[PDB]
């Protein structure tokens, strides 16, 4: 008798298509840029991942393979993760807020042709939607490495939010 | 021909159903085989259970035993955990732990009387003490970064019963006595070092002998088998000085 | 865990001799690296020492040139260093380490904090 | 006590040797487990044989015999093939195969007198006819790209042996009687597509 | 192997109407979107129809407004269109399909040649 | 008894040091950069990969 | 199981000599022949 994995493994920071009813999760091994989605067609959203206590700064990115720039700062202790939204080709780049902790985790999933991602400040983090159009057929690349975890499961999966990567005890 | 037959090989005899109560001492360790991967050096395709032979002896009534046995397992489960996908990352195909589900067998054989009798059986009996079998630690050579350790492990022995398998081949018997143990978990919890699973109920294959020569286990023994011994009877008139 | 033993110390005449030792047990200390350091008030620690994956490949610090020198016992898992006849300011503690980059996935942590004790 | 001690609990009785020789036909069918991997649907964690049962009956000079048996391996061959590494792969940790080196075990039993005299034993020979067992074809339902498919396999049963196994629990003796056949592969080979 | 089969041939009076069905055996065909194109002499095929895992939208292309419907059925794995009165530049064989774009890695062919015969 | 097999694995395109005695083998899958060695000290070198028939540019 | 015969006695006691002849190999040896009687002893022979 066999018994499953206690996670599903950290895979490679990869470009695909993940289906629905499926929290990705993430976690960084770099500054700056974590992950992107998009359909490129209405719908352009990236986030950066920031350490705590950085200034206000122009920074440069290699977003969307033509290096872009734009502002990130912080203040709290924690790490911050400012995501980037765009909505049409030309539109100025939204930079839209956030998502905060200390975990160094982010999560996101598609249900319903709507967009569910975490967002706020661990313990006290929770889930916010988008919606768009056409948006099973979005994509999603990543450039850290990454879970996956099927939906039944929002009990646990905000609690790894709250506090992921079960202890690592030496 | 393609129908039923019977014939009789002999005519009748005498058999007595005598009642030997002995009293036992067997004694076991564990085997376990590693088996690496081809690559850097940090998936681990196999650390399983394996037959493990050994033999001693001890006393018992004065008449020295000289005792034999294999010890093997069944029903075990077979975790996997893969640390990373990368070939610098750290992987264990399948590793063997034993649980409630799992039972655990040692063949045992011995060259004393009670013991060599037990060709043609009734019932056989027995009643042992229950021991803890524990797991000791295991440094998984990493040729990079800080080296996984495998730790803790306990779980009880209880008795579940006894087989007698008898292997034929032309006439001639090859037969094999196996103790068939239970198991029952224990504290502390068995956990593989800087890894995601930690406090996790077994006792993992890695080193079960922890250090040990051997798990003991003491016990009574009874038998009722069919001797051939006659009565004194079917004996020539002048039988005696 | 992961342990570094080290032997040698004491009162040392100046322009005498002695041997010091720094084994190591809970790694490979085979694809690792090695250095040597010296430790002191203010002026700071400073590079003594180099060998990684013994090329026929070293190199020394300033002040250590020919007075000191090296062996990295991969039979015993450890460096062994042959001391003489250098200046007061020697008085220190010495100290063996290695610091490894290589991209570890995540799901364990295959990090050091690699410093005996000296 | 730590001391030797005998009794006798039944004077002699008289016992006749006997040989018993029917023709038997054993039928068995196979069990295979497949199970998922937590995740997308792409790594199949187990597919490995599992112990089958199956129960009939025939005849046999017009006595019907009701049989009973159950089928399992033992030193099966593991074959651990990793297409790809990524969420998006195909894969299967685990799949069971056998081999020369394997041994393929099916117990069996019957309730006629012929079989119910089998509890104390001096002898047994048998001879089987050599049959050969082929593979059907799974299609793995992968939510993505081309369907694997796994095809072909083909072994041969020779007669290895038979046991005679009675576990013990309190004056009651459960028995079972275990052919042990041997393989030797043939064509066609098998193959995942 | 990987079986697409249709049916629903035959001659159409223009001002009329039929069935056309594309069923689907070796894939999963949820995961998948499906269209149609009508093939011909040297005008050249084009894109009829749209479905990609049921949004409640769809996409329907310039001489196929209306007097075409189409269906996607998951349980029956297929694709069936209602066709109905339309200009006589239907005469042409039309073809189900999809072309499949995601990475797969190496070892193994995920790869079709995604075409019915039509 | 467990069998080896055939291939290591198709692992990913990642950052690392090799150690020896060990033949790395690479299969392209786009144009362009198939991969980059280094010491970073005296040693730079990597490989481009072209399909066949490319003018000269 | 390696049978085991063991045991059994007798003690030849003697009763009367007489003339008898050896026919030996080389030539016909002029002899005496005692007739030992016989007698059960304890050991009881077995097949064990």
Redesign the interface.
């Known amino acids: 008798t066999t018994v499953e994995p206690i996670l599903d493994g950290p895979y490679q920071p990869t470009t695909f298509t993940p289906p629905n009813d499926y929290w990705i999760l993430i976690n960084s091994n770099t500054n700056g840029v974590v992950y992107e989605s998009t359909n490129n067609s209405d719908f352009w959203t990236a986030v950066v991942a920031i350490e705590p206590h950085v200034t206000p700064v122009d920074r440069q990115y290699m977003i969307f393979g033509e290096s872009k720039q734009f502002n990130v700062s912080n203040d709290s202790n924690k790490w911050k993760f400012l995501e980037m939204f765009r909505s049409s080709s030309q539109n100025e780049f939204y930079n839209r807020r956030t998502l905060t902790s200390d975990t160094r985790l982010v999560g996101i999933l598609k249900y319903g042709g709507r967009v569910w991602t975490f967002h706020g400040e661990t313990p006290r983090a929770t889930t916010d939607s988008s919606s768009t159009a056409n948006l099973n057929n979005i994509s999603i690349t990543i450039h850290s490495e990454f879970y996956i975890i099927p939906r039944s499961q929002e009990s646990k999966c905000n609690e790894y939010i709250n506090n992921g990567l079960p202890p690592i005890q030496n | 021909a393609q129908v039923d037959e019977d014939i009789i090989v002999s005519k009748t005899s005498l058999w007595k159903e005598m009642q030997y109560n002995r009293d036992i001492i067997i004694r076991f360790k564990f085997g376990n085989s590693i088996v690496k991967m081809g690559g850097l050096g940090y998936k681990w395709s196999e650390i399983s259970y394996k037959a493990a032979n050994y033999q001693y002896n001890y006393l018992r009534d004065g008449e020295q035993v000289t005792a034999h046995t294999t010890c093997s397992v069944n029903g075990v489960n077979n975790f996997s955990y893969n640390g990373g996908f990368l070939p610098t990352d750290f992987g264990i195909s399948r590793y063997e732990v034993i649980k409630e589900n799992s039972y655990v067998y040692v063949d045992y054989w011995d060259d004393s009387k009670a013991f060599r009798n037990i060709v043609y059986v009734r019932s056989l009996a027995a009643n042992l003490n229950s021991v803890r079998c524990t797991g000791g630690s295991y440094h998984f050579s990493l040729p990079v970064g800080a080296w996984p350790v495998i730790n803790g492990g306990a779980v009880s022995l209880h008795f579940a019963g006894v087989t007698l398998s008898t292997q034929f081949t032309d006439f001639v018997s090859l037969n094999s006595l196996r103790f068939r143990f239970s198991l029952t978990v224990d504290e502390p919890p068995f956990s593989i070092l800087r890894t995601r699973t930690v406090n996790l109920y077994g006792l993992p294959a890695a080193n079960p002998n922890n250090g040990n020569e051997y798990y003991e286990i003491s016990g009574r023994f009874s038998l009722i088998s069919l001797v051939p011994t006659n009565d004194d009877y079917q004996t020539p008139i002048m039988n005696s000085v | 865990?992961?342990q570094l033993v080290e032997s040698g110390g004491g009162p040392v005449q100046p322009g005498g001799s002695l041997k010091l030792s720094c084994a190591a047990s809970?790694?490979?200390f085979?694809?690792?690296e090695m250095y040597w350091v010296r430790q002191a008030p203010g002026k700071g620690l400073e590079w003594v020492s180099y060998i990684s994956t013994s090329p026929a490949i070293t190199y020394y610090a300033d002040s250590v040139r020919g007075r000191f020198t090296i062996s990295r016992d991969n039979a015993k898992s450890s460096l062994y260093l042959h001391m003489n006849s250098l200046r007061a300011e020697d008085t220190a503690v010495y100290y063996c380490a290695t610091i490894?980059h290589?991209?570890?996935?995540?799901?364990?942590?295959?990090?050091?904090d690699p410093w005996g004790q000296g």
């Open positions: 865990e992961v809970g790694f490979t085979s694809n690792y490894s290589q991209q570890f996935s995540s799901g364990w942590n295959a990090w050091f």
